[PDB]
C-alpha cells in the first residue's frame, strides 16, 4: 500500500486510517468543529 | 529555496510486496559476551558534530514534504542513531555492549521523556568485575562517546554500590547495592507537565532578555530570546541518501554553560530545577531511595540548537532556542569492558511495575511521541 | 659522637663561605673575603695565600693530591692556586657568580657551577673549557663527582631539580625532582647542597627547608629522610665515616647549630648548639677521623669522631 | 618518500636549549625540501579523554599542552608518554608543517621541513589552536 | 662504571660505532695502545717518539726519553703494564725500553739486541716476551732485583728441533695462565711455551696450521677463543682448551674474497670474544671490519676513516677504538655516541619509538629501613671489568705550568 | 507564519492529545473517536 511504502512501526498504522482524512481537514482550515465534525463525515 | 531530493525506484513499495520499508541496517559482527553474538551498525550515518538522524520513508501523501520519519523497530526500543560507532547490541534479547578492550561509550532509547512519570527497568546480563555499566538518564547535549552522568547533562547510577553520578561527582545517597548478573533496576522518572515547565522557561527567557543585558550584539539576540515558543515545535530536517539508504538529517544540541540566576531576596546564586522532578531507583521493586530532586531544565534557552549565528545575524531567520519535538530525558546506558545491560519498554515484560495510573511504559510514551511526529510531520506540510 | 678539639678562628672580619680539609686530611683551608688560609693541624700553624680575585669567593675544593686550592668568586672566575708556587690558572668562561666547584678523581679536571645556571667542565693542565652543560632554569647551587666513579655528576639548583649529568657526553641522565613547569608552582623546594656517598650509590641532598634526605638515584627513590626537630644560606652537610661501621650525617642551621644522625637508622644521636652561636653554618668537612665546621663569621671550629 | 618504518630508524634532530622556550628541536644535519624528519609519537587517545586530560594538566601547573590532533575524535598526547617530536615550538613564520599518513589502517602524524634547514637550527612549525617567536612579520598572540 | 648501569634496559652497546676524534699526532703514530684503564693513550711513532695523550682532553700530557735515552728509529710496539705505570717499548733502534711514568724524562731501564724487534709483550711489569726481526726463536727478558742487568733467554726447549719452521714473528702471552705463551713462525707453524718463573721452559703444542707468514696471534681476554692471521688473505679462529694441556677447534675462517685484502691487525671483544675487529690492507679499503664469533657473519664495517688502517687497540673500561692512518699518520678514534634520552628529564617521563593506545580507567570520566650500605665497593661495573685495581694516574706537571705562565 | 499561529493557539493541544490517545489503545472507527474528542473540547 501507501502505508508500508512509508515506513512501518505498528502503532504507525495511523498513515493507513486517519493520516489521509485528517490532512485533508486541515488544508481547508474557524473553531475546532469544522475539523471535528468533518473528523466524521468521510466515514 | 532547496527543493526536496527525487524520489527513486527502491523507495516505491505496492501491495502485493512484503518488504519493510524502514531498511534495516546492515550489521558487523562485533564481539561475544555470555555466548550471544553483538553487531554493529556499519553504514548508517551516527549522530556527531551535533547532527542527529532517524531513517525516514517516502510518504506520497505528502506533496510539498515528501518523506516522513519512520522508525525501525515494531515497539520502542534503542536509537540505532545515537551510540557510539564501537557500542554493540543483540537482536536477541536488545541487550547492548562494547568490546572488553573498549572504554565507556553509550546508547539511548528513542523516546523522549517530555513530563509525566515513567517507568521503565535495567536488566543486566554481564557485569563481572571488569565489565561496568551505568544505567542512568540524559538530555541531547551528553555525548554518547562518554558514560552518561560526567557532564550536567546526565543523572546515572554506578553497578557496583549503586552510587549516583551527576557533573562527575559520585554520591552515596541510595541504598547500597551491587548488582549482579540477573537483577532488574527500576527507575520512575517524575517530571512537571509541560505547561509549568514552560514558564519556568519563559521566565527563564526574560530574565536573561535584559536583565544580562543591561559578546557584541545585544540586540540581535535578545529579538531571538523574545522570538522564543517553547511549547510549538518548529524543526529542522533535510532528506538525504547515505549509501542508498534514507535518512532524516536534523540540527542537534551543544553543551553550554550551567545556567544560573541570582536571587535578590535570598541573596545567592540559585541553580535552576524542575518543580517536583524526581528520579527514583528500584532494585527488583523495593525502592533503594530517590536519586535526584533538582534535575535541571531543557526546554527552550535551557538547550541551544547548533546555529551559525554568522549567517543569521548577517541577515526569513531560524532560532537557536526551538524546540524540534526531541526535547527532555532519554533513558540512557552505558557499557566499559563487556558490561552488557538490557532496557525495557512494555508492560508485559516488566516483573515491578509500580501500580499507579498516571504511569506510562516507555513503550507508551514511544507511541505517544510517533503520534506527536506525525502530527508534526502533517502541520509543516502546511 | 664528636668531641671538641681545638676552635681554630675568631667570628669577626669579612665572609667565609666555605671551608674544607684536604684529601689527605693534615692541611684546613678557609676562605675570607678574596683571600685564603690553610692550616696544619699537626703544628696548629696557619698560611695565609693571597688570590687575585677582585671579589669576594663563595666555594673551595683541594685537589687531589692536596696541593692545590680551587677557589670560586662573585667576579664570576674560578683560580687554581698552588699553596706553594701560588695561583697557576685563571679560567675565566662563567658570566655570573661562581658557587660551587669541585675537582676530578684524577686532578686533571675541574667542574664549576655557577648562578648562570651553566656547569662548565674545566681541564685543569691546559686551562680551557670543555663543556657546558646548561640544564638548569636557576641558580646551579651544588655539584659532586663521587669518590671512585667520574663518570656522573649531580647538580642541585634553586629551581628545585636534582639532575645527574653524563661527564664523557654532558647529557642529562637522571632527574629526580620537579620544577616550576611540572608541579604546583609554589611547591618546589629549591635545593642547596648534593653530595654522593662513598660508594656513589646513594645521593644525599639538603632543601632550602632543611630537609635532607638520602637517595637512590638509579630507581629514583628515597630511602631515608632526616628532619630538624626555609632558610636564606645554603647551610653546610657532610656525611661524617667513622671507623666504626655505622656512619653519620651532620647538617646546619642559621644558627650555628648541628644535628648527626645515623643514616641505617634515622634516630638523632647527637646536638650541638653551643658553638657558632652568632652566625650560620655554610660549611662542614670531615676526614679520615675529623670534622670541621665554619659559621658564615670566621669562626672555625674542629671536631674528632 | 620514505616507508614509516624507515623514518623510525634513522634520527635527523634532537633537542637541545632553546631562544624561543625552555626546550626546543634542532637539526643535526641539512634536512631540506620536503622530507619526512620524524613522525609525532605519543598516547593515543579519544576526543573525550584528552579533554580530561587537558585540564587534570592545567590544574597540576603543567602550563604546556603537548597534544596532537590526528582527527575530531582521537588525539596524540606526548605529555608524558612520547617521543622527541614533542619539543617543536611555535611560530607564525615556520619551517615545518605536519600532515597525516594513514598505515594499516591507523592514522601518523608526520613533521615535514617547509624550507631547506641548516645544522643546529631549530625546528619550527605553526601550532594552529601569547607568542614568543622573534620573527618580525608574526601574531603575537598564540592563537 | 655508573653511567652505563643509567643506560643499560639489560644491555648496553657492546661496540663502538661513530669515528669522534682525530689525534694530529705531530710525528706519524705506528702502534697505539691504551692504558689499562681508558685513561692514556701511548702513541709510538716513526721517528721514535713516544707521545702519551691525556684521554679527557685528547690533548698530549708528556713523551718519553727526550733528556736520555728515547729511540732513535722507528718504534714498533708500546705496552703497558696492568699497573698502568710501567711502560713497554721496542723499535728499530734494537733496544727494548721500559719506561717509569714517575719519570718519563729517561729510560728505567733498556737492552739493546742484535737486530731490530717485532714487537715486545709484557707478561710482568718486569717481565716481558720479544720477537726479533730474522730471527728462529723468540726471546724471553726478564729483569733481576739488582735492577741494572737483564736476562734474556730463546723461547725454546732444550734441544727442541725447529729446523724448517721458519722464523719467529709474532708472540702472545696467555691472558690468565700468566705462564703460556703462543708464538707464530713464518711458515704457519703455531707453537705454545710454559715459564717456570729458572729458564727450563718446555714447548707444549706444535702444528702448522697455514703454509704461511703468521702476522699475528690474539687471545680472547678470558681463554675461550683464539684467532690467527695469515699471510693468505684469511683469519683463522679457533676455540682454546688449556689444563697443562692444549687443544685448539677451528670455530671459523674470515675472508674478503670480493675485495681480496690482507689484515694488518686484528682485535677481540672483551671477554670471551663474541667479536672480532680487524683492519683490512686492500687499495680504498678504508674502514674497519667487525664479525660476530659464533657465526662468522660480518655484522658492521667503521666508515670513519679515508686511509689505510693500521694498528688498533680496544680498550674494554673506556669502549672506544684506536687505529692510525697510513698516510697521514694520525690516530682515528671510534666512541659509543648514545642519543640523549629525553625521558631524564622529568623522572615520570617515557620516551616510545611507536604510539600507545591508552587503555581507559573505569574512572576515566570521574573526579624508611630498607637494607642500606654506604661503603662497601662495587668490585664489576655493567661490562664485567675488574675495578678496584690500582690504576696509575700521571701527576699533573706543576713545576712545568709555572715557566708556561711567562708565556712558555 | 499566520497559518501555524492559528493552529498552534487552538488546534495543535487538543489534536496531539487526542491523537496519543488512539495510538496508546486503537478502537475500531478511530477517526469517530477523535472527532468526538475535539467536539468535547469545544
Ligand atoms: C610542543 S611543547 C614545546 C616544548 C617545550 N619547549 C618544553 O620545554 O617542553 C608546546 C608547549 O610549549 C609552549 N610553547 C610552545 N611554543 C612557544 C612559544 N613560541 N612561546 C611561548 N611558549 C611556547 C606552549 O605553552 C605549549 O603548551
Ligand atoms: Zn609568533
Redesign the interface.
Known amino acids: 500500500?501507501?502505508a508500508?511504502?512509508?515506513?512501518?512501526?505498528?502503532?504507525?498504522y495511523?498513515?493507513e486510517h486517519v493520516?489521509?482524512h485528517?490532512?485533508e481537514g486541515?488544508?481547508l482550515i474557524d473553531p475546532l468543529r469544522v475539523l471535528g465534525q468533518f473528523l466524521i463525515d468521510a466515514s | 529555496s532547496v527543493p526536496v531530493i527525487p524520489y527513486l525506484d527502491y523507495?516505491?513499495?505496492?501491495?502485493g510486496?512484503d518488504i519493510?520499508?524502514?531498511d534495516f541496517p546492515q550489521l558487523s559482527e562485533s564481539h561475544r559476551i555470555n555466548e550471544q553474538q553483538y553487531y554493529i551498525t556499519e553504514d548508517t550515518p551516527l549522530n556527531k558534530?551535533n547532527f542527529m538522524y532517524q531513517?525516514?520513508?517516502?510518504?506520497?501523501?505528502?506533496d510539498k514534504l515528501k518523506y516522513?520519519?519512520?522508525?525501525y523497530?515494531?515497539?520502542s526500543s534503542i536509537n540505532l542513531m545515537d551510540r557510539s560507532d564501537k557500542l554493540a547490541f543483540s537482536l536477541d534479547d536488545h541487550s547492548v555492549s562494547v568490546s572488553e578492550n573498549c572504554?565507556?561509550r553509550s546508547v539511548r532509547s528513542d523516546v523522549c521523556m517530555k513530563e509525566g512519570k515513567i517507568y521503565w527497568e535495567v536488566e543486566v546480563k554481564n557485569v563481572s568485575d571488569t565489565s561496568?555499566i551505568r544505567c542512568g538518564i540524559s538530555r541531547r547535549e551528553a555525548?554518547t562517546?562518554?558514560?552518561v552522568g560526567?557532564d550536567f547533562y546526565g543523572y546515572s547510577i554506578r553497578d557496583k554500590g549503586l552510587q549516583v553520578?551527576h557533573e562527575?561527582?559520585?554520591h552515596t545517597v541510595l541504598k547500597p547495592h551491587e548488582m549482579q548478573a540477573g537483577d532488574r533496576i527500576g527507575f520512575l522518572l517524575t517530571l512537571p507537565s509541560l505547561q509549568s515547565q514552560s514558564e519556568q522557561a519563559m521566565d527563564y527567557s526574560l530574565k536573561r532578555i535584559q536583565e544580562l543585558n543591561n559578546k557584541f550584539n545585544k540586540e540581535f539576540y535578545k529579538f531571538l530570546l523574545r522570538s522564543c515558543?517553547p511549547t510549538?515545535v518548529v524543526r529542522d530536517q533535510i532528506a538525504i541518501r547515505y549509501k542508498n539508504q534514507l535518512f532524516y538529517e536534523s540540527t542537534d544540541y551543544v553543551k553550554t554553560t550551567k545556567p544560573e540566576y541570582y536571587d535578590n531576596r535570598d541573596d545567592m546564586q540559585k541553580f535552576y530545577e524542575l518543580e517536583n522532578s524526581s528520579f527514583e531507583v528500584f532494585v527488583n521493586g523495593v525502592s533503594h531511595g530517590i536519586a535526584f530532586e533538582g534535575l535541571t531544565p531543557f526546554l527552550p534557552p535551557f538547550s541551544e540548537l547548533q546555529y551559525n549565528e554568522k549567517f543569521y545575524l548577517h541577515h526569513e531567520i531560524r532560532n537557536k532556542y526551538v524546540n524540534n519535538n526531541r526535547l527532555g530525558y532519554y533513558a540512557t546506558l552505558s557499557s566499559?569492558?563487556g558490561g552488557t545491560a538490557s532496557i525495557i519498554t512494555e508492560a508485559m515484560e516488566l516483573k515491578f511495575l509500580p501500580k499507579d495510573v498516571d504511569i506510562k511504559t516507555l513503550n507508551?510514551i514511544?507511541?505517544?511521541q510517533?503520534?506527536?511526529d506525525?502530527?508534526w510531520d502533517?502541520?509543516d506540510?502546511? | 659522637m664528636l668531641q671538641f678539639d681545638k676552635q681554630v678562628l675568631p667570628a669577626s672580619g669579612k665572609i667565609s663561605t666555605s671551608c674544607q680539609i684536604s684529601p689527605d686530611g693534615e692541611l684546613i683551608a678557609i676562605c675570607q673575603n678574596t683571600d685564603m688560609l690553610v692550616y696544619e693541624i699537626s703544628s696548629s700553624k696557619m698560611m695565609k695565600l693571597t688570590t687575585t680575585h677582585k671579589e669576594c669567593i663563595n666555594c673551595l675544593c683541594w685537589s687531589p693530591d692536596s696541593k692545590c686550592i680551587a677557589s670560586g668568586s662573585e667576579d664570576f672566575t674560578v683560580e687554581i692556586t698552588h699553596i706553594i708556587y701560588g695561583r697557576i690558572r685563571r679560567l675565566m668562561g662563567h658570566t655570573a657568580p661562581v658557587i660551587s666547584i669541585c675537582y676530578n678523581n684524577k686532578g686533571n679536571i675541574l667542574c664549576s657551577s655557577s648562578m648562570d645556571e651553566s656547569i662548565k667542565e674545566w681541564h685543569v693542565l691546559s686551562g680551557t673549557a670543555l663543556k657546558t652543560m646548561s640544564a638548569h632554569s636557576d641558580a646551579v647551587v651544588s655539584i659532586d663527582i663521587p669518590k671512585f666513579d667520574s663518570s656522573i655528576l649531580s647538580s642541585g639548583s634553586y629551581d628545585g631539580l636534582i639532575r645527574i649529568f653524563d661527564t664523557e657526553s654532558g647529557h642529562c641522565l637522571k632527574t629526580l625532582t620537579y620544577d616550576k613547569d611540572w608541579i604546583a608552582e609554589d611547591g618546589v623546594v629549591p635545593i642547596s647542597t648534593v653530595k654522593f656517598s662513598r660508594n656513589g650509590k646513594f645521593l644525599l641532598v639538603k632543601s632550602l627547608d632543611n630537609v635532607v634526605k638520602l637517595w637512590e638515584y638509579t630507581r629514583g627513590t628515597v630511602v631515608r629522610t632526616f628532619l630538624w626537630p626555609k632558610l636564606k644560606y645554603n647551610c653546610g652537610l657532610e656525611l661524617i665515616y667513622p671507623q666504626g661501621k655505622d656512619p653519620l650525617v651532620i647538617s646546619g642551621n642559621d644558627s650555628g647549630s648541628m644535628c648527626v644522625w645515623n643514616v641505617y637508622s634515622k634516630n638523632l644521636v647527637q646536638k650541638i648548639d653551643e658553638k657558632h652561636r652568632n652566625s650560620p653554618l655554610i660549611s662542614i668537612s670531615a676526614s679520615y677521623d675529623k670534622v670541621a665546621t665554619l659559621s658564615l663569621n670566621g669562626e672555625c671550629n674542629l671536631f674528632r669522631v | 618518500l620514505s616507508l614509516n618504518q624507515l623514518t623510525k630508524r634513522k634520527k635527523p634532530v634532537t633537542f637541545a636549549r632553546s631562544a624561543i622556550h625552555n626546550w626546543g628541536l634542532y637539526a643535526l644535519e641539512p634536512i631540506a625540501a620536503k622530507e619526512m624528519i620524524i613522525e609525532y609519537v605519543g598516547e593515543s587517545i579519544?576526543?573525550?579523554?584528552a579533554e580530561m586530560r587537558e585540564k587534570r594538566y592545567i590544574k597540576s601547573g603543567i602550563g604546556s599542552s603537548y597534544l596532537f590532533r590526528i582527527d575530531?575524535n582521537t588525539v596524540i598526547d606526548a605529555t608524558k608518554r612520547g617521543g622527541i617530536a614533542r619539543f617543536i615550538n611555535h611560530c607564525c613564520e615556520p619551517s615545518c608543517t605536519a600532515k597525516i599518513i594513514k598505515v594499516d589502517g591507523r592514522k601518523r602524524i608526520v613533521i615535514y621541513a617547509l624550507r631547506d634547514i641548516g645544522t643546529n637550527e631549530e625546528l619550527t612549525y605553526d601550532y594552529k589552536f601569547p607568542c614568543l617567536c622573534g620573527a618580525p612579520s608574526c601574531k603575537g598572540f598564540l592563537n | 662504571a655508573n653511567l652505563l648501569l643509567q643506560d643499560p634496559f639489560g644491555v648496553l652497546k657492546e661496540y663502538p660505532e661513530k669515528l669522534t676524534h682525530t689525534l694530529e699526532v705531530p710525528v706519524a703514530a705506528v702502534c697505539v695502545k691504551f692504558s689499562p684503564r681508558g685513561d692514556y693513550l701511548a702513541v709510538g711513532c716513526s721517528n721514535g717518539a713516544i707521545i702519551i695523550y691525556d684521554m679527557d682532553s685528547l690533548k698530549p700530557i708528556a713523551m718519553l726519553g727526550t733528556h736520555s735515552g728515547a729511540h732513535t728509529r722507528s718504534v714498533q710496539s708500546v705496552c703497558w703494564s696492568n699497573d698502568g705505570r710501567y711502560l713497554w717499548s721496542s723499535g728499530r733502534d734494537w733496544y727494548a725500553k721500559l719506561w717509569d711514568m714517575t719519570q718519563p724524562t729517561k729510560c728505567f731501564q733498556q737492552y739493546k739486541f742484535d737486530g731490530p724487534l717485532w714487537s715486545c709483550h709484557v707478561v710482568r711489569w718486569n717481565v716481558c716476551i720479544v720477537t726479533v726481526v730474522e730471527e728462529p726463536t723468540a726471546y724471553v727478558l726478564t729483569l733481576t732485583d739488582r735492577q741494572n742487568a737483564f736476562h734474556c733467554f730463546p723461547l725454546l726447549e732444550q734441544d727442541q728441533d725447529i729446523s724448517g719452521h721458519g722464523y719467529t714473528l709474532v708472540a702472545c702471552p696467555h691472558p690468565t695462565i700468566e705462564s703460556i705463551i703462543i708464538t707464530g713462525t713464518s711458515k704457519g707453524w703455531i707453537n705454545a711455551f710454559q715459564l717456570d718463573l729458572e729458564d727450563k721452559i718446555r714447548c707444549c703444542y706444535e702444528e702448522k696450521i697455514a703454509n704461511a707468514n703468521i702476522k699475528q696471534i690474539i687471545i680472547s681476554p678470558s681463554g675461550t677463543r683464539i684467532a690467527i692471521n695469515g699471510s693468505d688473505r684469511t683469519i683463522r679462529q679457533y676455540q682454546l682448551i688449556v689444563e697443562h694441556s692444549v687443544s685448539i677447534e677451528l670455530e671459523h675462517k674470515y675472508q674478503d674474497i670480493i675485495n681480496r685484502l690482507q689484515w694488518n691487525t686484528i682485535f677481540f671483544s672483551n671477554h670471551s670474544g663474541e667479536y672480532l675487529v680487524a683492519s683490512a690492507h686492500g687499495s680504498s679499503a678504508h674502514d674497519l671490519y667487525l664479525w660476530e664469533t659464533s657465526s662468522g657473519s660480518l655484522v658492521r664495517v667503521l666508515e670513519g676513516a679515508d686511509e689505510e688502517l693500521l694498528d688498533i687497540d680496544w680498550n674494554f673500561y673506556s669502549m672506544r677504538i684506536a687505529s692510525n692512518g697510513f698516510e697521514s699518520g694520525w690516530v682515528y678514534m671510534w666512541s659509543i655516541v648514545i642519543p640523549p634520552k629525553w625521558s631524564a628529564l622529568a623522572p615520570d617521563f617515557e620516551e616510545v619509538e611507536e604510539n600507545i593506545d591508552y587503555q581507559?580507567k573505569?574512572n576515566?570520566?570521574?573526579?624508611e629501613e630498607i637494607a642500606i650500605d654506604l661503603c662497601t665497593p662495587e668490585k664489576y661495573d655493567v661490562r664485567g671489568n675488574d675495578i678496584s685495581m690500582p690504576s696509575f694516574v700521571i701527576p699533573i706537571d706543576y713545576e712545568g705550568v709555572i715557566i708556561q705562565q711567562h708565556w712558555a
Open positions: 500500500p501507501v508500508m511504502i512509508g515506513g512501518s512501526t505498528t502503532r504507525r495511523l498513515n493520516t489521509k485528517l490532512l486541515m488544508k | 523507495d516505491i513499495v505496492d501491495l510486496s519493510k520499508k524502514p558534530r531513517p525516514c520513508a517516502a510518504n506520497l501523501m505528502l516522513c520519519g519512520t522508525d523497530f515494531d515497539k572504554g565507556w561496568h555525548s562517546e562518554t558514560p560526567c553520578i562527575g561527582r559520585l515558543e510549538n566499559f569492558q507508551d514511544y507511541n505517544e510517533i503520534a506527536s506525525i502530527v502533517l502541520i506540510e502546511i | 579519544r576526543q573525550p579523554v575530531e | 581507559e573505569e576515566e570520566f570521574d573526579i
